[PDB]
Amino acid sequence: VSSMRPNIFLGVSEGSAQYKKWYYELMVDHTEPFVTAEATHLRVGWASTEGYSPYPGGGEEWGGNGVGDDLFSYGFDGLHLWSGCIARTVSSPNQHLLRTDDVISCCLDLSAPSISFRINGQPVQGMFENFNFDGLFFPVVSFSAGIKVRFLLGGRHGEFKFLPPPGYAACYEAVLPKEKLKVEHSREY
Amino acid sequence: HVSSMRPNIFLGVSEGSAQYKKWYYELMVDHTEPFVTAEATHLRVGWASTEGYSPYPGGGEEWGGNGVGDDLFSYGFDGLHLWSGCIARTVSSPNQHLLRTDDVISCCLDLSAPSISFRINGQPVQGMFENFNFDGLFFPVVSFSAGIKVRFLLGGRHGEFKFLPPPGYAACYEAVLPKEKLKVEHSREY
Secondary structure (H helix, E strand, O other), X not given: OEEEEEOOOEOOOOOOOOOXXXXXXXXXXXOOOOOOOOOXXXXXXXXXXXXXXXEHHHEEEOOOOOOOOOOOEEEEOOOEEEXXXXXXXXXXXXXXXXXXXXXXXXXXXXXXXXXXXXXXXXXXXXXXXXXXXXXOEEEEEEEOOOOEEEEEOOOOOOXXXXXXXXXXXXXXXXXXXXXXXXXXXXXXX | OOEEEEEOOOEOOOOOOOOOOEEXXXXXXXXXXXXXXXXXXXEEEEEEEHHHOEEXXXXXXXXXXXXXXXOOOEEXXXXXXXXXXXXXXXXXXXXXXXXXXXXXXXXXXXXXXOEEEEEEOOEEOEOOEOOOOOOOOEEEEEEEOOOOEEEEEOOOOOOOOOOOOOOOOEEHHHHOOOOOOOEEEEEEEO
16 A cells, blocks of 8 residues: 655644644545455545654654554545544445545544544544544545545645635645645555 | 655664675666756755754654755765765766666665765766765665656665675665565655
């Protein structure tokens, strides 16, 4: 499984009076038809830097693993929410596994805290809430071979298809000052 | 304009056993564009240190994905020049040229010297990096403009070298953390 993420890192510093509600969308451009359902993986959501792999000297690195396959990430696959390698079904209109032209809205509310999703503008009935966190969250997607997706982070270069829920800010605005917005892709060698 | 790639191989000094202090990999250039006037190209390969990561709140540190040699924590070669701190140092080699299709660049990191040196199509590049501080962990890295296609040859089954590493050098592939899978990360402007 491959993974992609932008360089957008969201957290709370107590007393900083930060913006705490963040929104982005993912558009699915292509999935592979001629592959089996067990060989297909497409999940989108959020992950925490607390899930990084440790290195000598206190270093920590993103592992690029499947969204929801650990205790520090939270994914949606169209039918299910994933966390801790466990899937749970959630309802949405016309619910289906993620496919070409789906637009997934991803919501992170660090004041709750909560994570929720929309599919093609419509609420997904089921959320993650009151999870403990100790790190920074980033948008993330994981996918099997040949799948093509794009982050829509807001603004001229990734316009949202849907209006964010009240109180939510566009993820592109959270880039660190002086850094350029970039997308990182991880794949097995 | 410029993208960057790296494997998850991190090389550094420790107080433990250190049979291998000299590390080697190759980069194969699969495609560069022939000469065109409407665009300038960029292709640099070498090494970077985690000390060049960008700091984030809470002590986080992230790879910036910037051009190799565009800061004081990375060390790049482009066929004609070595780059560090955004400055180019002219070096020489036989049959000299900016990197092009089918070039194989050897990259060498010697943590005992310390030094970073290069070969091009098997021949030594005359001019190396030597009088640098080498704090942090080093990783192979490449930076390139759009449409350029390159591959790391790190050693191991999936990336055999075209040339023998110089005496005393070990393949980067051997330094993967034992619980990690070998992956390549690609950074691109959004």
